[PDB]
Amino acid sequence: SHMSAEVIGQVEEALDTDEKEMLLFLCRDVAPPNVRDLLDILRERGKLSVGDLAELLYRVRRFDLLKRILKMDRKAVETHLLRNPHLVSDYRVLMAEIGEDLDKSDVSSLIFLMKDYMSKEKSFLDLVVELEKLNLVAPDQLDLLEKCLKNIHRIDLKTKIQKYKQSV
Amino acid sequence: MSAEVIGQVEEALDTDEKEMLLFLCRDVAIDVVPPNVRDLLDILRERGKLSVGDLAELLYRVRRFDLLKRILKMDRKAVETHLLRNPHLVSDYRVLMAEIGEDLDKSDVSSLIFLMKDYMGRGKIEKSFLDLVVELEKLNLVAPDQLDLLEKCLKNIHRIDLKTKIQKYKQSV
Amino acid sequence: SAEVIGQVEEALDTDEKEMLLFLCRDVAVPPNVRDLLDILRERGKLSVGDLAELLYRVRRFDLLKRILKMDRKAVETHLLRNPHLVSDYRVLMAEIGEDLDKSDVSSLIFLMKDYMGRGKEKSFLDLVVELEKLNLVAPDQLDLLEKCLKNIHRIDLKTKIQKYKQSV
Amino acid sequence: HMSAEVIGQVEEALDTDEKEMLLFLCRDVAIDVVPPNVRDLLDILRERGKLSVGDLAELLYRVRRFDLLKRILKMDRKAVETHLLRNPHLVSDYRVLMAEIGEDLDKSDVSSLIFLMKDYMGRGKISKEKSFLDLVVELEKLNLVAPDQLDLLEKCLKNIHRIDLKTKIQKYKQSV
Amino acid sequence: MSAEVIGQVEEALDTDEKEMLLFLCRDVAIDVVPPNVRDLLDILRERGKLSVGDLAELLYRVRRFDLLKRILKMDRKAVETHLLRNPHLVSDYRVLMAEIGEDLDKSDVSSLIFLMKDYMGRGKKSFLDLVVELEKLNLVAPDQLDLLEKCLKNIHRIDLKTKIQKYKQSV
Amino acid sequence: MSAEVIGQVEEALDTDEKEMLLFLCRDVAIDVVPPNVRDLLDILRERGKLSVGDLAELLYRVRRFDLLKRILKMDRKAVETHLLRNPHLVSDYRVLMAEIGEDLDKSDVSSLIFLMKDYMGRGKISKEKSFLDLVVELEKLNLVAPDQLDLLEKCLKNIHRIDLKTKIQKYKQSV
Amino acid sequence: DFSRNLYDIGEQLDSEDLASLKFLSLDYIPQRKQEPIKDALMLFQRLQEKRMLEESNLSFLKELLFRINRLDLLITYLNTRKEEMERELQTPGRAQISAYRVMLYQISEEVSRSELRSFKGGLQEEISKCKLDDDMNLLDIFIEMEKRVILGEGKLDILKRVCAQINKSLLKIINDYEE
Amino acid sequence: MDFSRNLYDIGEQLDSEDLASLKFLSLDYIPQRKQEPIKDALMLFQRLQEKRMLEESNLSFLKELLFRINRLDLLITYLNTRKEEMERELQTPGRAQISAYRVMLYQISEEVSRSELRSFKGGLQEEISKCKLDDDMNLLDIFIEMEKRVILGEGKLDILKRVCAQINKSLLKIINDYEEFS
Amino acid sequence: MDFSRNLYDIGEQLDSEDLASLKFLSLDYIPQRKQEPIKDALMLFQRLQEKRMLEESNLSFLKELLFRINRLDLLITYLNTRKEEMERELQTPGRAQISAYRVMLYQISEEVSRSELRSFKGGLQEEISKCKLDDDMNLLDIFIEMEKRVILGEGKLDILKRVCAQINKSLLKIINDYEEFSKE
């Protein structure tokens, strides 16, 4: 019911490395070297109520931690998300979702296509940040990413981008 | 419980047995995810949960009866007696998951993942059955009292024998 | 002799000198070990037994043998037979600090930050000193320390604290 | 005491079956550890003081590589046999027996043996080819086969109609 | 010789070699604890303990034969001849500890530290760091090697236990 | 030349290329041990060993001709002209060691390190390290040098790399 | 789009084509860099680093695809016919894959499985201290022979001895190369 | 309707020969690099889903594949589709996704027996290498090889006709019917 | 007795022809992908065990299979079961687990000789592709191919009847007895 340092410590010790990286990526617009500092900074700025932390755990799909640490289930978090503004934008969720649907061979192919417009173990989220730093991808600038996803024959992921654009 | 014995055990186990051991202890060290078996046994020992009986239970559950006999000087009956008269470190649910996993071959696991990924919102990710169970637990899709989805999917890949193992566990509960 | 003071000061490393200053904080605060030992000598409090207790508590048994020509068992008998220079509370803090790795100390400092703020990497004994200055820990006030040790899953250290409490 | 050069010459001269046999034969010498390959095994034997010239000669004799005995160690059959008569063996007669049995079992026979034994073993479903020596190791982990505990193996060899292999076991027991 | 060679040596050694050098001189600079190698070499120089023969011995024990050749124009044979005919700055015990250290791979060192954790606290790395910690606790010494032999046998390094036994015979 | 050009070079190389670059310059920067490629290139610049032609030689030696063109606007003609008209930063011995290293696969390097453990402690060199790492350890022990290649030849012969022994003999004949 | 075209070409090449392309590039990409190359794109990237492949220099890629008989890819993605390739490669100094390497590839192209087993047995005879691996194809055998300097531009004696024991057309490919 | 379960069941009824046929009929949509690891039907279906050529609301390509390999049993049992519906749909201009050329090659391969396959390989001795004319090669693999050498294509049928005319004239009717249709 | 040893012994008495028959009679329970690698009886038994159609306390399907391929020797020697017991059991309504249609096709295959098999394939030339009429195909393989093309099934006997009536009238009798019994 209350946010505390104990809760932040529990969350940080339970997440694995991939989940920690995803969490840092998802919070790039609310901004940190690591997840504990990130959550502490969010708490200090009044952006880490129990509901905010539940949203973050929901976005990294750690429903076990939602239940065990925050005593909330899926429906409670979805209710909170419908009633309150979202800490993590739909663009960030979409980028992580595309990343989870790409295997390493797909990411290598995508990097080969995109290098002309801009290092072999980079995840998709790493590539997205480099593209954001270069003004090549943004919530309102998805045509290049969509074209490259189409050109590696991931029409399903192009369609996820199209449904996002229609949601806006 | 000495470090010499922990070291002997850790060097004697193979990769699959070590992964099983890490899976079987997920409810004892629920907070932390130990990176390897030596750290796991060290954490258990420091928390007072790695007596001779606890270690014997673990070796029994990974079917290393040679190590039971050689390192702890016990046979199966004695560990079975200890288990009949003491609380268990590893629950019947974890034992069941590991047993299902040994009865599935890699083709079976591929078929099972194909059916279950629709319910997981799973990405495009070779994983063992125990890795899959861990992923399902993180999604709150399987639990000692929540086996219907797993039972249904095992039924749907025509492992009626394994569905029956799940039903027998449910009856024991 | 006075030269033993120089020998001891030169033989201890930085962590041992810090522990030594921490262990002597209850005697009527010296900035370094040479000043501490000079003060003890001036007060008639630096007998062979006093120095042996200090070297034993910082676990320099090599120095016990080389400087005072005695072993662990002689000092333990002396400590069973005579009043202690260093209190059981200080010994308890130093022993806890000796059973915590870097990760444990970082987690403890993070938990304590809600109570003491940033403060001034940092050792467990530094944290204890900062907590003492803010009246957050004392020989008769250990509940907060117990709570933090429990939250980092060091129940063994909590029960060590409890056995200390029951001895008093 | 043996050079890396000699270990390399041995390891490069052996084929897959001989390498797997050598790893099995040395399971009592280096019991606490699972070596991943023959070069690691031989270096482990060096660290344990169990790779004198005689030890290596014995290993080469047990995989029947008299060409390597001659070329690498300048010994023949008679020298290693005299050494074995006068010195404790690295490799027990039980391990020699298991390897001898496995030499005469094909993969069909081993899958039949597993089918017969799987219920005793509490074994799962493993859709991967196993040698007889792999199965012996699985049984050893279960305390189901040992130098003094061959009755189950004998009965299952009888049940797949390899009375010849059961007879090898009986000759071992009589020799002991 | 001059302090310029001291600077050359300090610049050319890597961190592991510097840690080993500090370990090897713990009985020479016994009344001090040098914080780094430069200070160690400065202290040795001042005490008349860093002649050409001494530096050659030290570089030989950290196995920088390249520096032996470049700085002192010596090779293995010359330093070994010097060592056969002159008193050694570094005792056979320190040499033994360093040689055991360099025949231990990372997994071995981890297993040793884990076994030793039964004799000391969690807060307290290389094999030489472990030896220093054991020396501080009077758990290992030139005449007190049984604990080390037991730990080496328990990690199946019988060759290294044998090296210790040879040392004990030489005493 | 500028700090921006050095930064571009450092950003473009992968780990193997940076390690090779550090190895190839071991005879230039001998009174300082550079911890990384940025520090190495800065030191070489300060000492007058990083003109455009020098950097082009380094990029040529790691075979990054794409970088030659993109960063320095040169091709093999100009780099080879520079190497014919100027002393080389990297000796033929260093080039030979790198060439041997690039002809060895992971199994060959593993076999070589295993053979060299008869000359050095097991802790000196890890199983997964590169041929150039092994060469560095051998140099520190004075077991390989421009005029001392017999042990290397013996080891290459023992792993049946007669082609690499032949490269060494051609190097020796060039002297 | 240059990079996209390279990607598409790479999507049409499976593991066997890739092994052939790697063998034909052996004189420009050494064994350490060959080992991690698991798809054609990695091979192309290595060629780009040497500037042997760029938007303005397609010659080596065209020669590679021609030598592995992927004329479909030549016409579809590089707008090039067989006859242009033949006349280009018959011009002295234009071919960048040596005649020796091509010769070896063509031998490996006409050896069947059973003929590969006869080859392996004869070469194990010449190699009496090392048991060869059993999964090796003929190109791997050629690489192993070169490592021991028992096969090369100036050393075809063992190759001839083994091929003559197998088939006379192989000796023909060799003799035409020598001519 | 359980879509994933239905795909799984369909896949359990397809063995390695049916799979080889399905992969050949998909050659114009799944390139050789992505074909190589496809060892069961589910991997094939996953690739089609990534191209959005297969989903619960879009079964047309899967139906066409099963129709063209003559698995009418699967069409009726798992996709509620009869032969006559498939004929009507695929005879509608613009609805077929497998080209007539690709279908034509598959039908030729359906009509060539083992001894006729040996004769076919004998006919190509001068155009194809021996390791590609080995006994471990079926007619579809030979066609793929001929396509790689541009001696077979939508507009290069001369060699195919020459070889087929030395075996059976029914093969030439399949070719000639295709030519009339195009 | 030991269940696993008894299954192994039964399996040692079944050659590749018996196995082909058993796999055919099991077609409605073991799909084609899982049929392909089955090369000995034990793999067939593992398939049946995973579906719980064969276990120590449930030998019914195994007995029915052995009865239908006329291995009465194995039934009595290894399963203590006589022909009359099986006849009584399988005539009990609802008890047979191999359909009468599948048994009927197996019995046709038992009555068609080598030359008659060549004539049968000749009869199907307009319905089955030539490669699926190759000389190594047995009649059961042909039936499977006809079923895939849905020109053979429980309610689709016209082509089977045409070809069998050109082969022998006794074949038509087997078909017609099945067709009359099945409408029950």
Next chain:
Amino acid sequence: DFSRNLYDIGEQLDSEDLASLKFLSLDYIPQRKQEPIKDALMLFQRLQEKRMLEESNLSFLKELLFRINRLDLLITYLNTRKEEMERELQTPGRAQISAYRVMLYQISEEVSRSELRSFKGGLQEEISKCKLDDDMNLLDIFIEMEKRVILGEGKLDILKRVCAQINKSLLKIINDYEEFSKER
């Protein structure tokens, strides 16, 4: 040298010898293992695996060669005469090939090709047509009748009825076997 003797013996035995040897070994080598036996040496290996054939135990091989009338091989390679075998095998309990199995083999040696055709005609209603095809010899037919338990030590009725319609000497072989088996 045992292995060479076995090799040489196997080299002197043709495909008719081998078909007979496989039939006479039916009670010791099961059908799955009979199928891949295409040379006598493989049959000898199966016998060695059962410890029914070794250098110190030649008795089964001698009995086999005697019963298939290769007395030349018996004397040349196994130092054994006809009279020694007759003396050994005439006391009840010495034969490892049962009197029943020998009786069936002797029937097949006495039946000509035309009589074989009559035999097949006699079995029209007991065996399927595929097991009466032109390629089937009498020994294969006997095996099929045993699988259906219409032929065995205690079931000679169909064998007698069919042989009686062909030749009285066949019936004599059967009846002498039966009367002798009833003597104890």
